[PDB]
Amino acid sequence: MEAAHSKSTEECLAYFGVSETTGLTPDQVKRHLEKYGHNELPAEEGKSLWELVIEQFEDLLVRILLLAACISFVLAWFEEGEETITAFVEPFVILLILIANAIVGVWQERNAENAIEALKEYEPEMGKVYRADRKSVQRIKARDIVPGDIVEVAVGDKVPADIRILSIKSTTLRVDQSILTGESVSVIKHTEPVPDPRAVNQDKKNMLFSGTNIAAGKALGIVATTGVSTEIGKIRDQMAATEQDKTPLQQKLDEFGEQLSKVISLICVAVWLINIGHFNDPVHGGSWIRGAIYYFKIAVALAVAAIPEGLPAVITTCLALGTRRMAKKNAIVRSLPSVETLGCTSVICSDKTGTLTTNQMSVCKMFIIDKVDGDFCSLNEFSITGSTYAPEGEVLKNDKPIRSGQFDGLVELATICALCNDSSLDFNETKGVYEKVGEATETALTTLVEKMNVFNTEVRNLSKVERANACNSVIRQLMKKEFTLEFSRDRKSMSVYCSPAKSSRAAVGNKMFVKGAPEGVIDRCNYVRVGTTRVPMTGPVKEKILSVIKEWGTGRDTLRCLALATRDTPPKREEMVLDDSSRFMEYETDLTFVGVVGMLDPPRKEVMGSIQLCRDAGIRVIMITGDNKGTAIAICRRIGIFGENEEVADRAYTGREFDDLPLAEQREACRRACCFARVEPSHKSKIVEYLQSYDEITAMTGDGVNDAPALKKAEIGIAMGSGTAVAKTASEMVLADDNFSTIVAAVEEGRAIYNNMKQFIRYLISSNVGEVVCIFLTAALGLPEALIPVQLLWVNLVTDGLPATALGFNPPDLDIMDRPPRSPKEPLISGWLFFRYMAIGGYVGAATVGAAAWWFMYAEDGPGVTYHQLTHFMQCTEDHPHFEGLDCEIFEAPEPMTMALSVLVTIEMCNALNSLSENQSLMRMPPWVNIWLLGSICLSMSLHFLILYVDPLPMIFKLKALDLTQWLMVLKISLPVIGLDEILKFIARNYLEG
Ligand SMILES: Nc1ncnc2c1ncn2[C@@H]1O[C@H](COP(=O)(O)OP(=O)(O)CP(=O)(O)O)[C@@H](O)[C@H]1O
Numbered sequence: 003m004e005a006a007h008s009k010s011t012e013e014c015l016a017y018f019g020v021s022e023t024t025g026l027t028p029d030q031v032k033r034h035l036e037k038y039g040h041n042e043l044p045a046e047e048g049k050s051l052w053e054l055v056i057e058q059f060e061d062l063l064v065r066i067l068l069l070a071a072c073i074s075f076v077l078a079w080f081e082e083g084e085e086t087i088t089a090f091v092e093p094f095v096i097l098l099i100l101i102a103n104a105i106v107g108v109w110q111e112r113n114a115e116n117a118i119e120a121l122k123e124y125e126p127e128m129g130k131v132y133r134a135d136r137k138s139v140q141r142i143k144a145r146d147i148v149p150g151d152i153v154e155v156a157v158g159d160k161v162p163a164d165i166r167i168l169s170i171k172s173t174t175l176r177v178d179q180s181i182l183t184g185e186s187v188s189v190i191k192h193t194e195p196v197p198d199p200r201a202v203n204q205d206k207k208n209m210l211f212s213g214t215n216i217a218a219g220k221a222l223g224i225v226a227t228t229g230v231s232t233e234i235g236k237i238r239d240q241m242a243a244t245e246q247d248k249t250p251l252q253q254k255l256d257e258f259g260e261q262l263s264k265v266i267s268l269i270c271v272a273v274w275l276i277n278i279g280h281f282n283d284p285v286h287g288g289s290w291i292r293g294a295i296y297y298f299k300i301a302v303a304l305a306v307a308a309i310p311e312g313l314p315a316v317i318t319t320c321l322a323l324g325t326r327r328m329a330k331k332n333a334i335v336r337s338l339p340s341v342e343t344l345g346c347t348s349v350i351c352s353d354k355t356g357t358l359t360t361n362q363m364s365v366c367k368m369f370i371i372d373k374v375d376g377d378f379c380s381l382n383e384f385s386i387t388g389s390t391y392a393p394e395g396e397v398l399k400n401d402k403p404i405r406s407g408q409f410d411g412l413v414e415l416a417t418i419c420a421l422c423n424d425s426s427l428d429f430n431e432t433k434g435v436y437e438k439v440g441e442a443t444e445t446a447l448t449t450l451v452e453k454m455n456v457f458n459t460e461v462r463n464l465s466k467v468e469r470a471n472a473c474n475s476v477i478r479q480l481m482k483k484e485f486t487l488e489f490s491r492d493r494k495s496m497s498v499y500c501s502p503a504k505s506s507r508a509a510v511g512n513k514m515f516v517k518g519a520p521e522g523v524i525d526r527c528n529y530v531r532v533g534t535t536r537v538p539m540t541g542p543v544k545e546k547i548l549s550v551i552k553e554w555g556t557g558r559d560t561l562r563c564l565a566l567a568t569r570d571t572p573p574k575r576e577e578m579v580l581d582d583s584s585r586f587m588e589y590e591t592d593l594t595f596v597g598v599v600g601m602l603d604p605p606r607k608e609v610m611g612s613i614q615l616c617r618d619a620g621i622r623v624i625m626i627t628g629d630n631k632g633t634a635i636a637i638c639r640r641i642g643i644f645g646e647n648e649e650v651a652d653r654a655y656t657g658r659e660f661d662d663l664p665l666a667e668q669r670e671a672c673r674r675a676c677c678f679a680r681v682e683p684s685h686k687s688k689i690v691e692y693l694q695s696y697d698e699i700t701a702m703t704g705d706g707v708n709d710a711p712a713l714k715k716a717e718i719g720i721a722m723g724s725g726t727a728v729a730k731t732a733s734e735m736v737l738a739d740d741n742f743s744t745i746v747a748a749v750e751e752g753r754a755i756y757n758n759m760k761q762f763i764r765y766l767i768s769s770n771v772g773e774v775v776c777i778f779l780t781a782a783l784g785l786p787e788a789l790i791p792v793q794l795l796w797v798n799l800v801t802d803g804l805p806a807t808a809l810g811f812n813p814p815d816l817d818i819m820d821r822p823p824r825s826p827k828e829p830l831i832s833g834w835l836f837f838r839y840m841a842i843g844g845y846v847g848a849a850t851v852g853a854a855a856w857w858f859m860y861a862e863d864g865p866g867v868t869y870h871q872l873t874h875f876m877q878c879t880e881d882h883p884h885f886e887g888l889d890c891e892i893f894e895a896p897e898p899m900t901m902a903l904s905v906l907v908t909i910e911m912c913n914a915l916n917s918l919s920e921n922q923s924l925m926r927m928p929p930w931v932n933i934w935l936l937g938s939i940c941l942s943m944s945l946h947f948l949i950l951y952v953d954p955l956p957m958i959f960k961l962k963a964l965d966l967t968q969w970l971m972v973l974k975i976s977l978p979v980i981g982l983d984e985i986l987k988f989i990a991r992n993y994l995e996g
Pocket residue numbers: 189190204489494495496517518519520563564630
């Protein structure tokens with residue numbers, strides 16, 4: 003059943019053809035269960051660790067290194083009676099890496115806790131119905147409720163389905179709808195039509211929404227919808243639309259996967275063209291068994307050389323460390339990549355209530371009457387400080403602290419605030435904070451009474467649990483509450499009837515203390531309290547007081563105001579009927595006006611300063627709130643989202659006003675406006691979506707169920723530590739201490755991390771370049787591979803491993819938070835930078851093949867000098883006569899390859915220094931800057947020496963140590979790499995773009 007809010011109750015009843023005093027028949031229920039299904043949200047799984055690892059071995063690139071693992075496996079099985087000893091270390095070091103990279107791939111991409119499950123917390127197991135087969139209410143499984151059911155809800159109930167209210171049995175029905183609005187202040191419901199077809203939830207004052215709860219009262223309704231066709235079901239569906247997105251760089255990775263997986267396919271058929279080049283002269287001396295196997299040997303070496311394995315690890319490590327740094331600021335990152343995604347954020351959307359503000363309603367202004375001089379009426383105004391329910395803060399007069407007990411009118415105000423009140427305050431020993439018990443707007447009065455301390459009660463030595471209600475208790479000892487005239491919609495006030503406690507001195511006679519909406523309470527006042535005296539309420543006085551109250555209600559203030567009054571001479575208890583709320587207004591007449599209090603939900607202290615820092619970093623903050631527009635704009639002004647006099651006509655929108663815009667203007671509104679109010683959970687995700695459709699990287703901050711969709715849609719979702727489980731499990735990061743400042747800190751960390759990543763990804767790739775250049779030089783020319791897989795694997799995973807991780811520890815820049823956010827599209831190399839290490843890569847790729855072949859010809863030991871014969875080793879077995887003065891096995895010596903590797907290891911270790919900075923020469927930026935880079939290379943170096951000098955190591959890696967002349971030759975053929983790039987920096991810091 004649709005549009006239940008605009009139908010009258012008779013139309014809803016007639017639609018299902020049921021009586022409110024009977025309900026559906028059990029047969030009808032059966033038919034509706036068929037037709038509409040059960041009243042429950044579908045669970046959303048998330049692949050077993052099975053289908054996750056499987057998906058790690060799916061993306062093309064990863065297969066390339068599996069190919070060269072199976073091929074490596076075969077070309078290590080049918081290994082001659084020679085060294086089948088360690089031929090399998092290759093197809094295993096590889097087969098091992100792919101294992102490790104998967105387990106890690108999943109340990110960071112997997113979101114443990116499920117936000118749809120948390121949401122089901124709001125689905126009660128049980129609901130109450132009236133069905134035709136019994137007169138009395140029936141308590142059943144909620145999932146068995148169907149459209150058409152007559153349902154009964156009561157105080158403390160979770161509402162089981164979307165329900166048109168038929169009949170309110172209590173005097174009021176007060177509903178907490180925070181899961182759809184973020185607001186915890188009770189909604190007072192009624193049963194009349196809400197004609198607007200486009201009514202937003204905050205307007206549907208005659209509806210009950212599944213998953214909200216009843217803060218008070220009793221009602222009967224008819225179920226309009228169940229299952230996913232409910233408001234909470236829409237939230238469930240937006241969280242189920244699981245886009246499993248990915249970090250900008252993580253999409254760069256996924257991208258480069260496609261990049262590198264073709265570069266290899268091309269280079270392999272390219273090695274094949276130069277392999278088929280001397281296919282026209284094989285002299286068929288070794289058939290093709292030798293040829294089709296020397297070609298796979300090459301593929302495995304190229305594939306291995308191209309893929310920069312170990313990359314996944316240095317990154318994961320970088321991220322994880324980042325996570326550790328943020329945890330120390332009280333930012334709990336739940337997704338490794340996110341720690342860095344925040345860095346490129348350009349727009350931060352934010353819930354207001356409980357996010358930007360404390361979600362703790364606070365009396366911050368009050369007034370009583372000081373003097374009435376005929377027509378003129380002087381008010382005594384005070385402000386009150388503090389922003390939580392904690393009874394911490396002081397009452398100020400002109401900004402200076404005063405003792406509330408000095409003023410008789412305040413004693414009376416406190417008395418009414420304390421007594422005309424169904425709530426209290428409680429100190430939660432487990433969370434370490436004060437919490438309300440009852441309505442927010444009432445607990446604010448409770449808190450006020452504690453701050454006011456009008457009897458100067460000693461409270462400094464109380465436990466926090468006793469302190470919670472101390473000054474309210476002292477007032478209870480003076481006046482005994484005898485009964486309450488509860489709130490009704492017609493009068494918009496409530497009152498409590500009180501007698502002076504036994505042993506008066508207080509003051510003889512019974513009293514009624516009244517609070518309510520100003521206009522109705524003041525209209526029923528005939529007198530005004532001035533100190534302890536009472537004077538007649540006149541028109542001009544009534545008008546001054548109403549005017550000031552109206553200013554408080556619409557200011558830069560926009561406070562909720564209550565007027566406080568007391569009936570000085572109540573009726574006698576016996577003349578009043580308590581069972582009829584319709585009589586209460588009359589009993590609360592002939593009142594004496596006492597004062598007014600104004601409360602708001604105030605900003606957290608750090609928010610303003612954080613917004614400014616964001617602005618300084620080129621980040622926009624947009625408030626998106628379920629709350630009213632007036633309050634929303636006012637809070638925006640207090641926190642510097644808007645100027646205090648800025649005109650915001652087209653900078654602030656309700657969800658409706660936003661919906662009214664042409665679809666084109668909706669997109670543009672999102673770039674211009676910074677406040678969206680009276681919004682539904684969908685509006686928040688829609689705005690995030692628009693933002694993202696300008697390719698803005700966008701964050702969402704929230705604490706509520708109504709933020710869950712936006713939290714899921716944003717590139718980065720951020721939840722408040724003290725907010726809902728649902729919002730937390732929908733996030734990438736949680737601010738455990740609710741400190742908004744931490745977001746600013748997280749951005750910096752993220753920019754720091756982004757800079758170090760991109761360059762250690764360059765350092766690691768410049769490497770994989772030379773290797774390819776080499777595994778291709780020593781392939782096309784027909785030379786004996788200068789390096790083989792098992793060695794490359796060590797280099798890329800370990801030799802370059804440490805140093806890369808060292809670079810992820812370089813110091814962040816000093817202006818890092820004075821730049822605008824980097825563009826999402828920004829590559830990782832451009833023009834100058836690409837050919838930069840295609841030059842450093844052309845050097846490594848060569849200087850390695852060139853120090854291995856050196857050991858042949860112009861080197862001492864030194865088979866050796868063969869020249870054109872060296873590029874022709876295939877015919878040493880066959881065409882031996884050519885090779886006279888040499889053996890036919892010394893073409894497979896460890897020394898030459900140890901020369902090659904020792905060059906790479908030496909070039910890369912150097913290439914790690916020119917990686918410390920992008921442009922700043924080592925001249926102007928010392929190599930002693932990042933000490934950890936030093937310990938990093940000395941480790942890589944001392945590991946290199948190892949696999950050269952340890953009985954096993956050199957056989958598994960095919961190395962044979964180098965003389966001190968074999969190392970002078972290495973250095974004098976490696977170090978120059980520094981001067982090379984070093985001059986590439988001098989030609990970029992001046993004549994390029996600096
Ligand atoms: N228990 C209580 N005792 C006394 N006064 C109360 C009260 N609960 C609410 N009020 C006062 O009476 C008014 C009645 O609230 P009501 O149902 O009219 O909502 P609202 O006007 O705040 C709703 P909306 O934002 O959707 O238009 C409140 O604004 C408040 O001043």
